[PDB]
Amino acid sequence: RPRFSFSIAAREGKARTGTIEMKRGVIRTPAFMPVGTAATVKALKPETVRATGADIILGNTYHLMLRPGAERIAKLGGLHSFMGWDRPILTDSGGYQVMSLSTKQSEEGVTFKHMLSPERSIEIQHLLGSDIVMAFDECTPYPATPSRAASSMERSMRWAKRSRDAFDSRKEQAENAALFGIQQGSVFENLRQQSADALAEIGFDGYAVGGLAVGEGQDEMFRVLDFSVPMLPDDKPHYLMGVGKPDDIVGAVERGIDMFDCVLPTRSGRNGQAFTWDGPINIRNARFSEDLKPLDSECHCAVCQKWSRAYIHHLIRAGEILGAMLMTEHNIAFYQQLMQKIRDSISEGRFSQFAQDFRARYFA
Amino acid sequence: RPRFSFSIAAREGKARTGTIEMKRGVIRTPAFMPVGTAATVKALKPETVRATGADIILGNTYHLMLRPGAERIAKLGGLHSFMGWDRPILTDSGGYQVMSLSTKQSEEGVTFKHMLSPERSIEIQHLLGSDIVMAFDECTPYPATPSRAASSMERSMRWAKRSRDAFDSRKEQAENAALFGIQQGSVFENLRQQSADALAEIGFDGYAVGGLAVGEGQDEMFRVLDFSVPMLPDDKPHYLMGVGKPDDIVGAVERGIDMFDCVLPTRSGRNGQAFTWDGPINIRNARFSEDLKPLDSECHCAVCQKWSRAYIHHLIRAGEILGAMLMTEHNIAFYQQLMQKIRDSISEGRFSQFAQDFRARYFA
Numbered sequence A, B: 001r002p003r004f005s006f007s008i009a010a011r012e013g014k015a016r017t018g019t020i021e022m023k024r025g026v027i028r029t030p031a032f033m034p035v036g037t038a039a040t041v042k043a044l045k046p047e048t049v050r051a052t053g054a055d056i057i058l059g060n061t062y063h064l065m066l067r068p069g070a071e072r073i074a075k076l077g078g079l080h081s082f083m084g085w086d087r088p089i090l091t092d093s094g095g096y097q098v099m100s101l102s103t104k105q106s107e108e109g110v111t112f113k114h115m116l117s118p119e120r121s122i123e124i125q126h127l128l129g130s131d132i133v134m135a136f137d138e139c140t141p142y143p144a145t146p147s148r149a150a151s152s153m154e155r156s157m158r159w160a161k162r163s164r165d166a167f168d169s170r171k172e173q174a175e176n177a178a179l180f181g182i183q184q185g186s187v188f189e190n191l192r193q194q195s196a197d198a199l200a201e202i203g204f205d206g207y208a209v210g211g212l213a214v215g216e217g218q219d220e221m222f223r224v225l226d227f228s229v230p231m232l233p234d235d236k237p238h239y240l241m242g243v244g245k246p247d248d249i250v251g252a253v254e255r256g257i258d259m260f261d262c263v264l265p266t267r268s269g270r271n272g273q274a275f276t277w278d279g280p281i282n283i284r285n286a287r288f289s290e291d292l293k294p295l296d297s298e299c300h301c302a303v304c305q306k307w308s309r310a311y312i313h314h315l316i317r318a319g320e321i322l323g324a325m326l327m328t329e330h331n332i333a334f335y336q337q338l339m340q341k342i343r344d345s346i347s348e349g350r351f352s353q354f355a356q357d358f359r360a361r362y363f364a
């Protein structure tokens, strides 16, 4: 099997559909990655994650590098063996959550209550046995002045080069894994261009659009994607970090994005929000107490084949673990079915119509 | 399929092994019943409960009669349909937990902050669609004076007759379900005898030993079982309510018990205690942080086929739902494997040796 091979099978406008072949499996694009926090996709066995259609998961690095620790996970055989997921894992750099969850910044890296640098991040992801490694970057806060956005983006580009060099120095990592760079530049077109130029000069297997989904709102996010994604190499995957709601995903695919990760389906699941083709519902609402219909009328997932809204309503109101399990499996399956419909409609040259039909019904 | 047919295939001393055939399935005895609280075996899908080997589950009635309510569950198609378990369900009467979790007692029944009577209990269990219905009784507190134990037991016997009559008056229930009576009498042999006599005079499909596992300790529980179980009809199942730890179960089978229920494997599971053939372990203990062995070296369950102690240690310490899921599935599977070994050893006339071997290793 190849280390990393991206093939585009079909296009419609800026939207693409295709495959990434890697040693541990094939990734169908556009792809949604369920998020594994602390080496688990919350409330799901890996076999259930796979049953929903997921080809790849995102492994958060931040918690794992603290406990059990990256060296310990490597001693235990790597993250794949540890958690029982044998397909590709994309690991984040650890830095985003350092800024969010724990700090002193410098050119070397970030110190926090430990020092995380581009080199240490790459080594940690190596020890975990990551298939897709993210360059260590800085997510510029929103809003930012042009000067602050510029200095931040430039530091990220220097860190991108350091990430590239550290990755390339580790033969086994370079042979078996892939490395993605992350574009910054806030909402500023000229800075996004400078960032894309820098990343392309270094060269990566894929390119993420960073610095978005940080409070700017969908209109602004879409505006920035409009000019930012075409700046990236067309022949490599485009990854939008931390996105998003179903409508965010459809619009981002319309703008050339191939990969997504988001905690929404899992987090929402546990909190009682189920995604349906007619929009989200809160299953705790009294209107579902005697509703024998499945969560969604069309959904192919095992939860909708077997249990009613009324039962899941009861479980979530009772605080039962099975409620979290069933809601999460359905929500992840819904996201995967959304990605499948996106892939099929692009392949068939009817994605524009699908996007329109999806929105009309989802927001009715 | 028959409504209720108990067949004893083999005996060794007071121990029996056999089958109960019912309309929704066969129950292999001695049997362990996982407990479903609020219409779920906590942290397990019904398919997983079945995969562990369970033939029947216990449905607590107390919470369900409050929310969603018995009438509501009946409107939704009954408990089996509601929770997705299509095999036999034994329901308790609701009264034990009324005394434990919420009271004014009278000859009519128990009032609590609702009135629960033998007639109302039987009707609630009917509405849930129970396969094995428990007579409504009073669990005498321990310790009790002989006079208090006597008056309590006598009230329970009057309630047993009322339970019998209410059950028999409902044609569909009498045709499709079974009814068990519950022996009381505290630790007093003469009262246990009077209770057994009363229950046999009324006639039930099975007989529970009530009033035990309420603080008396194993030595005393075994002493009471020694004389109490032979008082019950030999040709019907014997059910020990709320028992217990693995060694409690082995000793109770040695004394003629055929059926068990206990929250221990599920509750312990969530709290980090795993049962093994070498005794219980607390998976949170630091000694398991790098232990790549399964929870138990011989266990056939899916958890022990795939995940390490180290991973489950990590999950439970992180408060992850998957930790509760995996611990619970293993513990229920362990209990079922214990029951299978008990059944096989009685069938083969080597149960005495099994009990000795089990204890020597479990308590080493």
Ligand SMILES: O=c1nc[nH]c2cc3[nH]c(NCCN4CCCCC4)nc3cc12
Binding pocket: A092, A096, A137, A138, A139, A140, A182, A209, A210, A211, A212, A213, A214, A241, A242, A243, A244, A262, A263, A264
């Ligand atoms: O620029 C980034 N570099 C590295 N990692 C990132 C992660 C991100 N995550 C988000 N947004 C997360 C949005 N999410 C929505 C659901 C609720 C929790 C927050 N933007 C990001 C940008 C970056």
Ligand SMILES: O=c1nc[nH]c2cc3[nH]c(NCCN4CCCCC4)nc3cc12
Binding pocket: B092, B096, B137, B138, B139, B140, B182, B209, B210, B211, B212, B213, B214, B241, B242, B243, B244, B262, B263, B264
């Ligand atoms: O005499 C009884 N009548 C009706 N229901 C019962 C339920 C019982 N449950 C117990 N003991 C429960 C022990 N269990 C052990 C694990 C932790 C929670 C308590 N004795 C019981 C007697 C009775």
Ligand SMILES: [Cl-]
Binding pocket: A242, A243, A261, A262, A263, A264
């Ligand atoms: Cl997110």
Ligand SMILES: [Cl-]
Binding pocket: B242, B243, B261, B262, B263, B264
């Ligand atoms: Cl119990």
Ligand SMILES: [Zn+2]
Binding pocket: A295, A296, A299, A300, A301, A302, A303, A304, A305, A330, A331, A333, A334
């Ligand atoms: Zn579904």
Ligand SMILES: [Zn+2]
Binding pocket: B295, B296, B299, B300, B301, B302, B303, B304, B305, B330, B331, B333, B334
């Ligand atoms: Zn096991």
